[PDB]
Design a protein around this ligand. Structure first.
Ligand SMILES: OC[C@H]1O[C@H](O[C@H]2[C@H](O)[C@@H](O)[C@@H](O[C@H]3[C@H](O)[C@@H](O)[C@@H](O[C@H]4[C@H](O)[C@@H](O)[C@@H](O)O[C@@H]4CO)O[C@@H]3CO)O[C@@H]2CO)[C@H](O)[C@@H](O)[C@@H]1O
Ligand SMILES: [K+]
Ligand SMILES: [K+]
Ligand SMILES: [K+]
Ligand SMILES: [K+]
Length: 467
């Protein structure tokens, strides 16, 4: 369904898509091939929907965190740049777009949130979050506010939640442990409570979103905002003289923004892959190409070594990198989707007074991992990992109905692969129930009960945070 001979590109509306079009135009006059740049709303949700059915754009732009989910769903084409090209970019940017050992996208630029302040309202920005209430009290007397930023997206509140100990998934022994979520520890509670207190004490508003915060700062109504490099262009256009600096500390600890790598993935169902690779490697990822995008809306610290050498002289880029080095790279695991939705809900509910901080974060911890992932853990860790290889052979025998080239493929499959195939075939609930029935057929009554009990535990947890 994807038209061959042209390039369709999806990029978020807050990025420099006009500049990217200019790169596309130059790419056209050099090979006669049309390049269309679109910025549909909720593209990071639309893409896994429309690309699963073989459609969608040829190239999708987003921060790297979404791409692992896409890759697990087989939506992305593996990219293979020559080592000569790989040397052109910083190694850590390639690290961000690597999933299960394979490169699943081209890294473009490194983004981190910074504290943006109005130099005319506030010559010396605060070093701590704790100073902010007093600063607000002072500025309110002048008819201004201290700080306004997007409270509707958890990306912006995360640096504060993570400052004193909050985290997404524990990284240990070279992998993210999805059984170890840190959105409900003492550090997370402390961070979110402080934000909620700012609202209760009338220093912020719960309903503040991106557009409200941007307008307020760019009109000189608020002394500070929190935003990324993509926002600098609009501030340049405004009458506000601004500085970009390190985020305030909380409890003596640096704010820890999630570091995003803007990345370009290629649709696995695209007939223009080779064209897409050519566009990215030879037109976009060049000094001239990146400059075109960057002049529309700043990219931050770009992945291209040669161009970044120039951009790094910018004090705003230095501030971006300082904040990034105090932060954490976003995990790209498929569970990141569930994580973000959960924390988004937690922050919104707590800020609005709908839930207490404790109840909101308790719910977020349970919801940070999707049911299918948890059910897969039951099937694999509690079920298959508790039986021998010979017992696994007896198990696979009962999987002959769900024909899956069981002649040789199923006989070769390891435990993870067996679990994946059952869930892919019947859905998570049916896969776990079938595993239980097979264990009961093999007379593993004890093991089957343990699976039932674990399933009951998971279901009860989800139930206790819904109403
Ligand atoms: O619940 C309803 C909302 O859901 C949709 O947004 C989701 C996304 O689908 C998730 O992917 C996630 O979003 C993350 C995002 O993945 C992450 O990269 C980061 O996004 C930054 C981005 O890196 C940066 O370049 C810049 O564009 O700002 C972004 C943040 O605004 O952080 C996101 C989370 O805040 O979670 C959200 C929901 O929280 C849908 O798009 C929404 O319209 C919908 O309301
Ligand atoms: K993901
Ligand atoms: K405010
Ligand atoms: K300005
Ligand atoms: K502090």
């Amino acid at each position: 369904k994807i038209e061959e001979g042209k390039l369709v590109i999806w990029i978020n509306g807050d990025k420099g898509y006009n500049g990217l079009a200019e790169v596309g135009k130059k790419f056209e006059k050099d090979t006669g091939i049309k390049v269309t740049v679109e910025h549909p709303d909720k593209l990071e949700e639309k893409f896994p929907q429309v690309a699963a059915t073989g459609d969608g754009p040829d190239i999708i732009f987003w921060a790297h965190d979404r791409f692992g989910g896409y890759a697990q769903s087989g939506l992305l084409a593996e990219i293979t740049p020559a080592a000569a090209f790989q040397d052109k970019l910083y190694p850590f940017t390639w690290d961000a777009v690597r999933y299960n050992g394979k490169l699943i996208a081209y890294p473009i630029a490194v983004e981190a949130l910074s504290l943006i302040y109005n130099k005319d309202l506030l010559p010396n920005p605060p070093k701590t979050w704790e100073e902010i209430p007093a600063l607000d009290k002072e500025l309110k007397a002048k008819g201004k506010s201290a700080l306004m930023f997007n409270l509707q997206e958890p990306y912006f509140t995360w640096p504060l939640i993570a400052a004193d100990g909050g985290y997404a998934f524990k990284y240990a022994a070279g992998k993210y442990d999805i059984k170890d979520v840190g959105v409900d520890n003492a550090g997370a509670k402390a961070g979110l409570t402080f934000l909620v207190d700012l609202i209760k004490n009338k220093h912020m508003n719960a309903d503040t979103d991106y557009s409200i915060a941007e307008a307020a700062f760019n009109k000189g109504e608020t002394a500070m905002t929190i935003n990324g490099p993509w926002a600098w262009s609009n501030i340049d256009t405004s009458a506000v003289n601004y500085g970009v600096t390190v985020l305030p500390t909380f409890k003596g600890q640096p704010s820890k923004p999630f570091v995003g790598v803007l990345s370009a993935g290629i649709n696995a169902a695209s007939p223009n892959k080779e064209l897409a690779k050519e566009f990215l490697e030879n037109y976009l990822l060049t000094d001239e190409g990146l400059e075109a995008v960057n002049k529309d809306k700043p990219l931050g610290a770009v992945a291209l070594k040669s161009y970044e050498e120039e951009l790094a002289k910018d004090p705003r880029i230095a501030a971006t990198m300082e904040n990034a080095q105090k932060g954490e790279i976003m995990p790209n695991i498929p569970q990141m989707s569930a994580f973000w939705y959960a924390v988004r809900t937690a922050v919104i509910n707590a800020a609005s007074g709908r839930q207490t901080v404790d109840a909101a974060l308790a719910a977020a911890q349970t919801n940070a991992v999707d049911m299918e992932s948890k059910y897969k853990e039951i099937l694999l860790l509690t079920g298959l990992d508790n039986i021998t290889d010979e017992e696994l052979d007896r198990f696979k025998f009962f999987l002959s109905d769900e024909f899956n080239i069981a002649t040789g493929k199923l006989h070769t499959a390891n435990r993870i692969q067996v679990a994946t195939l059952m869930i892919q075939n019947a859905g998570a609930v049916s896969a776990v129930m079938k595993t239980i029935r097979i264990f009961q057929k093999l007379n593993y009554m004890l093991l089957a009960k343990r699976l039932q009990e674990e399933k009951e535990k998971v279901d009860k947890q989800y139930k206790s945070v819904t109403k």
